[PDB]
Amino acid sequence: ELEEMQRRADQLADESLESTRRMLQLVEESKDAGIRTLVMLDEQGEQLERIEEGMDQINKDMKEAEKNLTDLGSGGFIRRVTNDARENEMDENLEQVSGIIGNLRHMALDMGNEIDTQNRQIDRIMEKADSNKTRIDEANQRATKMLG
Amino acid sequence: MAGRSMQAARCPTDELSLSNCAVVSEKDYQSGQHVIVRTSPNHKYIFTLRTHPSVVPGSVAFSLPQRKWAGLSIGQEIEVALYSFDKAKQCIGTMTIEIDFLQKKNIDSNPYDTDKMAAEFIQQFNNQAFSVGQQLVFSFNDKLFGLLVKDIE
Amino acid sequence: TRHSEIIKLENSIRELHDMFMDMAMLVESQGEMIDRIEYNVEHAVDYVERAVSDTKKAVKYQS
Amino acid sequence: MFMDMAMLVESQGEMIDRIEYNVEHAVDYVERAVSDTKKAVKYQS
Amino acid sequence: SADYYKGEESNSSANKCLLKVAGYAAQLEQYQKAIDIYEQVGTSAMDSPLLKYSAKDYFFKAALCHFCIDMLNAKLAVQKYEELFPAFSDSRECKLMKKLLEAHEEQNVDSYTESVKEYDSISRLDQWLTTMLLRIKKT
Amino acid sequence: GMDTSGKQAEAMALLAEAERKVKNSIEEACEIYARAANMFKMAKNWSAAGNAFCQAAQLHLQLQSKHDAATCFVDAGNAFKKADPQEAINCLMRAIEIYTDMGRFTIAAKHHISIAEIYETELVDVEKAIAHYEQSADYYKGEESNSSANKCLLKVAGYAAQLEQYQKAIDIYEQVGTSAMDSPLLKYSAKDYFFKAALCHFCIDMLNAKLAVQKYEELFPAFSDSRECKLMKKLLEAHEEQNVDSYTESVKEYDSISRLDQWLTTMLLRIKKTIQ
Amino acid sequence: GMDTSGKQAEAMALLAEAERKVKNSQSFFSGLFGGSSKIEEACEIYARAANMFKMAKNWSAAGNAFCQAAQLHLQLQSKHDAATCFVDAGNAFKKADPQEAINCLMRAIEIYTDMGRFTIAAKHHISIAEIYETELVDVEKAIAHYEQSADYYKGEESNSSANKCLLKVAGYAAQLEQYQKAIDIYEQVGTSAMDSPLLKYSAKDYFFKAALCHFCIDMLNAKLAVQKYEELFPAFSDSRECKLMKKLLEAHEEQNVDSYTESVKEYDSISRLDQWLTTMLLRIKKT
């Protein structure tokens, strides 16, 4: 009876250790995942800037061509209820995790510093693109005005 | 002789399994013959042939204990070649077989006359090939036994 | 002190969840806009290519 | 959900690279058309 | 705008507009339309591969509206929501719903105060959520 | 309301004018038809606008149009998607054919996916959806689209395991795992694919399943590290010893620790049905 | 399948019609001087035939048709369209065999760099490097192609792509037993990354790579490199890489091979190892 309860308590402690190890491993993997996500987001932002510059150049060239054409004409983590050395390491692990998660939070903010802004920029160029299309369409119509 | 491709087959009847003979088709194989079966680069096992109409044409089938010992599964491919026994060095002095009960429900502690068991084993498996480490099933007086060959001297 | 660290971790997790949701919705909107502009630019480039090819053919035939 | 984000961002990145290639093709086509037009009008004059 | 987006098949903008209008209606005491919109958004998120895990929160909003209507039908409504989405059990929204029901069953001051304090300790409740909570608690 | 009636009258007048112009007689008729379709769409009456869209598409394609005709056909199909699924499917298939003849496989694959999903949700059809998914997968393979190709492969493997033979799904899972082994980012999902294959291998035989899971573990070391390996070991031991209590305890523990989407539970029940 | 057979038959008929049209184009030009419309029509028909072959999944036939269209349009002086057709032919060949793709991409790069299309030339150099890496094992050629692509990218001021090529080149070089170049590239990338907060985190990996590369030389210079990295980036101590290299140095100070193996296993458990990491660790254990 009591021996079975003690065995169950020991198994629960082992499960807690396994959970702590899984937590540590998962956070460690998430750190690399976040680093890769950050670098990929930076690459995507640079690509978006390269697209915006190209579209601005397209608009400038189209306007110049149209003009030319028109003008042509911490305190504790695990209670020492069961003693054992394991608890010690457990504490450290959670402490480590704490620090890590703090760091992780910072990384999140970093991504934001770019993400939202990029979206806004995209919207602007999108509008311009539509206008540009209309303009060339109008030019085509104007090109057909003289033909009749 | 040269070897041919084959499809894995399962023994259809318990009586065929009780004889510890590989069930083969009459078209290419005949009862009483011995074959060597290659299942991997260095896995070879010798089995006796028993004919049964239900066998798939050109196929060799083994009982569940034989498949488990050889790790045979439906859909896998193994090689089978006819073999001829040479008594120059294959004479058997005595066989040592480890015997176990297949089902726990039928286990009894009563003594058994091992001479009768040996005689029945020889009669049921006469003119058959046995290799060390072979796992098989044996029926004796409505009693099932899992037999493992310790050694042949 | 355990309760303080627990609540701090929970608050951090909730803030991360909220930021995740917001930026994920924003990224989905960004993807929708990028798809729309891709389609628009493809249509525009195809149309201008066809128009310029027709103009070149017409001028070459006339001259 | 982080794994889902990772796959979604990978898809967005590949699509953005394809869009960049399309943009390069379109700008080259437009530049060639403008060059041909300017040369033709200069020769006509 | 929501109708135009639906005609154009824009899920994100349509969902945003529906959520905004449902919230405004709830602030205006039009519980039926707000609860219908919240339920539709929640089921759509559940069906969609993404935003399903957050759909629980949306469900709570719908529940809140029903919680203002009556108490005897509240048990049936929560049972239907649970059986519809069995995974909702582990959600803290179900905990809030059951705690609020229990607090309203017995006329005492400590239950609702401690419930609101505990739920605030995690995240700051929205102004509309707090207004509806105060309205239901006062009666 | 009055707005709907006015827009309907305007659309009818524009259609009559376009019919008169085409009878007398070139792009003016198509422009009038498109304007009528847009005006009808303004009314919010999705019905009867698709007819104008189809008339415009046919008239514009009759004069050798390739890009604009395809875009108009796609718009007509999208308009019918809410109004009439069959007409939407027909318009989408015509646009697919036109674009593929033009060489634009992306639009064709997207329209095939849309047709498959509309068949799965609105109508009742899976085989045609599977064929459309396979065609889209081939089209995106022509474009070496890794993400779309992987998604289509996963969907096809899942559907085949649910209904069809398992060899294709098993091979797809093995190939995906091998490809992801070198890739670090995707390695985490790789194990899952192997796990899926194991379940499929159980539909044939228990010893075959044991061999398949052993092969998957050997091929990918990480598959052994995950607790899923222990879960499979326990499941196989319980099946070997023929003890329903252990199976029930294992499935209950898996459900409690991790939520289920009715797929793993279905496969576990199928496996247990033959335990006898 | 019947549909595939019909598509193949239609593609063969279209190819025969294109052959007849290109044959008769010369006769028409000689007898009437009708212009170059025949060549353009033949190129369009070849493109359609390639599309049909892709329908039937024939890489070789589509590549041959694309090559024929490319040469036909090159005879038309349309250098840009000829280069585009050659690039399409190379892409088609990449499906089956990039043997022709090498010369196709070389010609495309030459044409593009003649006019100033540097971005596409750099992308084609990257494609050539990938083809060489996947087909052959000659790393040096891939490195040279990557440097050429990076130079072309910097020529157009289009960054965010040359940096990745340089990083991949450094990763390859670290495995080729070359110290000076790999260390210089790693330190340059790290010092560039520290300035940018987003990439500052990635600098630790490059510092660890440089430390491992310099560790094979000797323990004394390895300690100096570790101290230099610590002084430059003290926060590098927080990363597990610095702890790992310090543990390896301490174990080698006493030749405690069991401790080294335990540390390596612990690091692998913390994060799955890579082929380069395992190779470097095995090489370091040699001394």
8-state DSSP, F165: -
Name every chain E residue with its beta carbon within 8 A of the beta carbon of F44: 3, 7
CA distance E55 to chain D (A): 14
Token readout for G271 is 């994060």
> How far apart are the C-alpha atoms of A11 and A27, rounded to whole Å?
24
Burial of B12 (0-12, 13-18, 19+ CB in 10 A): middle
Q: Which residues of G59-70 are buried (b: 16+ CB within 10 A; e: fewer)?
A: bebbbbbbbbbb
Residue reference for tokens 């598409």: F57
Breaks (C-N over 2.5 A) in chain G follow: none
The separation between the first and the last C-alpha atoms of chain G, rounded to the nearest angstrom, is 62
Resolution of the structure, angstroms: 3.8
CA distance A79 to chain C (A): 10
Between strands B60-62 and B9-10, the pairing is: parallel
Name every chain A residue with its beta carbon within 8 A of the beta carbon of D34: 61, 65
Token readout for E112 is 């609702």
Please name the residues in contact with E131: beta carbons below 8 A apart, sequence gap of 6 or more: E27
> How far apart are the C-alpha atoms of G16 and E2, rounded to whole Å?
55
Residues G246 and G226: beta-carbon distance below 8 Å: yes
Name every chain D residue with its beta carbon within 8 A of the beta carbon of E50: 4
- Number of Cβ within 10 Å of residue A100's Cβ equals 16
Of the residues F147, F176, F186, F187, the best mutation for testing chain D's interface (the one with the most D CB atoms within 10 Å of its CB) is F147
Of the residues G73, G113, G115, the best mutation for testing chain D's interface (the one with the most D CB atoms within 10 Å of its CB) is G115
Residue reference for tokens 């007398």: F24
- Number of Cβ within 10 Å of residue G79's Cβ equals 15
3-state secondary structure chain C: CHHHHHHHHHHHHHHHHHHHHHHHHHHHHHHHHHHHHHHHHHHHHHHHHHHHHHHHHHHHHHC
Residues E17 and E5: beta-carbon distance below 8 Å: yes
> How far apart are the C-alpha atoms of A126 and G7, rounded to whole Å?
40
Token readout for C18 is 């909220």
Chains C and E physically touch (3 or more Cβ atom pairs below 8 Å): yes
Name every chain A residue with its beta carbon within 8 A of the beta carbon of G164: 43
Q: Which of F152, F82, F80 is nearest to F110 (CA)?
A: F152
Vertex B5, ends B2 and B11: CA angle to 5°? 115
Between E3, E9, E87, which is nearest F259 by CB? E87
Q: Determine the 3-state secondary structure of B139 from DSSP.
A: strand
Helix (H) or strand (E) holding B38: strand B34-40
Q: Determine the 3-state secondary structure of A72 from DSSP.
A: coil
8-state DSSP, F183: -
DSSP per residue, F82-108: HH-HHHHHHHHHHHHHHHHHHT-HHHH
- Number of Cβ within 10 Å of residue G286's Cβ equals 6
Q: Determine the 3-state secondary structure of B149 from DSSP.
A: strand
> How far apart are the C-alpha atoms of A95 and C15, rounded to whole Å?
20
List, as own/partner pairs, every contact residues F44-50 make where C-beta atoms lie below 8 angstroms and the sequence separation is at least 24, other chains included.
F44/E3, F44/E7, F44/F4, F45/F4, F45/F7, F45/F8, F46/E7, F46/F79, F46/F82, F46/F83, F47/F83, F48/F8, F48/F11, F49/F11, F49/F79, F49/F83, F50/F76, F50/F79, F50/F80, F50/F83, F50/F84, F50/F87, F50/F88
8-state DSSP, B56: P
CA C30 to chain centre: 3
Please name the residues in contact with F13: beta carbons below 8 A apart, sequence gap of 6 or more: none
8-state DSSP, G234: G
Please name the residues in contact with F213: beta carbons below 8 A apart, sequence gap of 6 or more: F198, F201, F232, F236
Of the residues D7, D8, D14, D39, the best mutation for testing chain C's interface (the one with the most C CB atoms within 10 Å of its CB) is D8
**What determination technique applies here?**
cryo-EM
CA torsion through residues F195, F201, F202, F205, sign: negative
Burial of E55 (0-12, 13-18, 19+ CB in 10 A): buried
Token readout for E53 is 């895990």
Q: HSE-up of F241 (CA within 13 Å, CB side)?
A: 10
Q: HSE-up of F89 (CA within 13 Å, CB side)?
A: 14
Residues G193 and G166: beta-carbon distance below 8 Å: no
CA separation, residue F232 to residues B115, F120, F207, F269 (Å): 46, 33, 13, 15
Burial of G43 (0-12, 13-18, 19+ CB in 10 A): buried
Q: Which of A77, A98, A97 is nearest to A86 (CA)?
A: A77
> How far apart are the C-alpha atoms of A71 and A82, rounded to whole Å?
92
DSSP per residue, G159-219: -SSHHHHHHHHHHHHHHTT--HHHHHHHHHHHHHHHHSHHHHTTHHHHHHHHHHHHHTT-H
Please name the residues in contact with G105: beta carbons below 8 A apart, sequence gap of 6 or more: G87, G90, G124, G125, G127, G128, G131
CA separation, residue F204 to residues A41, B58, F166, F198, F238 (Å): 45, 24, 9, 11, 18
Counted residue by residue, chain B has a size of 153
State the greatest distance between any 2 C-alpha atoms of chain C, in Å, as a whole number: 90
Rg (CA), chain G: 27
Residues B33 and B25: beta-carbon distance below 8 Å: no
CA distance F211 to chain B (A): 10
Q: Which of A47, F42, F200 is nearest to F11 (CA)?
A: F42
> How far apart are the C-alpha atoms of F223 and F213, rounded to whole Å?
9
Q: Which of G126, G130, G138, G225 is nearest to G179 (CA)?
A: G225
Between strands B21-24 and B60-62, the pairing is: antiparallel
Chains E and G physically touch (3 or more Cβ atom pairs below 8 Å): no
CA torsion through residues G43, G48, G51, G52, sign: negative
Residue reference for tokens 């970093």: A110
Token readout for F162 is 């649910």
> How far apart are the C-alpha atoms of G264 and A21, rounded to whole Å?
18
D29 and C42 within 8 Å at the Cβ level: the answer is no
Residues B63 and B16: beta-carbon distance below 8 Å: yes
Please name the residues in contact with F256: beta carbons below 8 A apart, sequence gap of 6 or more: none
What amino acid is encoded at B21 in this protein?
C
Q: Which of G124, G164, G170, G114 is nearest to G145 (CA)?
A: G124
Burial of G246 (0-12, 13-18, 19+ CB in 10 A): middle
Q: Determine the 3-state secondary structure of D26 from DSSP.
A: helix
Token readout for B64 is 């569940």
Token readout for C40 is 């628009």
> How far apart are the C-alpha atoms of G123 and D16, rounded to whole Å?
15
Residues E1 and E12: beta-carbon distance below 8 Å: no
**Chain E positions with Cβ closer than 8 Å to D:** 49-50, 53
Q: Which of F30, F53, F29, F27 is nearest to F40 (CA)?
A: F53
Token readout for F126 is 């899976």
Residues D18 and C37: beta-carbon distance below 8 Å: no
Token readout for G272 is 């799955």
Q: Determine the 3-state secondary structure of B10 from DSSP.
A: strand
> How far apart are the C-alpha atoms of B43 and C39, rounded to whole Å?
62
Q: CA G123, G129, G135, G141: dihedral to nearest 10 degrees?
A: 160
The answer to whether residue B74 neighbours chain F at the CB level (below 8 Å) is yes
- Number of Cβ within 10 Å of residue F62's Cβ equals 11
CA torsion through residues E67, E72, E78, E81, sign: negative
Token readout for E87 is 């995974």
- Give φ, ψ of F30 to 5 degrees: -65, -40
DSSP per residue, G42-79: HHHHHHHHHHHHHHHT-HHHHHHHHHHHHHHHHTTT-H
- Number of Cβ within 10 Å of residue F231's Cβ equals 16
Residue reference for tokens 């543990």: G247
Name every chain E residue with its beta carbon within 8 A of the beta carbon of D4: 49-50
Q: Which residues of B62-80 are buried (b: 16+ CB within 10 A; e: fewer)?
A: bbebbbebbebbeeeebeb
CA separation, residue A144 to residues A141, D38, F25 (Å): 5, 19, 20
Residues G154 and A44: beta-carbon distance below 8 Å: no
DSSP per residue, chain E: -HHHHHHHT-HHHHHHHHHHHHHHHHHTT-HHHHHHHHHHHHHHHHHSSSSHHHHHHHHHHHHHHHHHH-SHHHHHHHHHHHHH-GGGGGSHHHHHHHHHHHHHHS--SHHHHHHHHHHHHHSPPPHHHHHHHHHHHH-
What amino acid is encoded at A41 in this protein?
L
Please name the residues in contact with E107: beta carbons below 8 A apart, sequence gap of 6 or more: none
List, as own/partner pairs, every contact residues A129-136 make where C-beta atoms lie below 8 angstroms and the sequence separation is at least 24, other chains included.
A129/A55, A129/C37, A129/C40, A129/C41, A129/C44, A130/C40, A132/A58, A132/A59, A132/A62, A132/C44, A133/C40, A133/C43, A133/C44, A135/A62, A135/A66, A136/A62, A136/C44, A136/C47, A136/C48
Q: HSE-up of G186 (CA within 13 Å, CB side)?
A: 24
Token readout for G197 is 């907060």
Q: CA E11, E12, E17, E20: dihedral to nearest 10 degrees?
A: 130
Q: Which of B80, F24, E11, C1 is nearest to A76 (CA)?
A: C1
> How far apart are the C-alpha atoms of F219 and F99, rounded to whole Å?
42
Helix (H) or strand (E) holding A33: helix A2-71
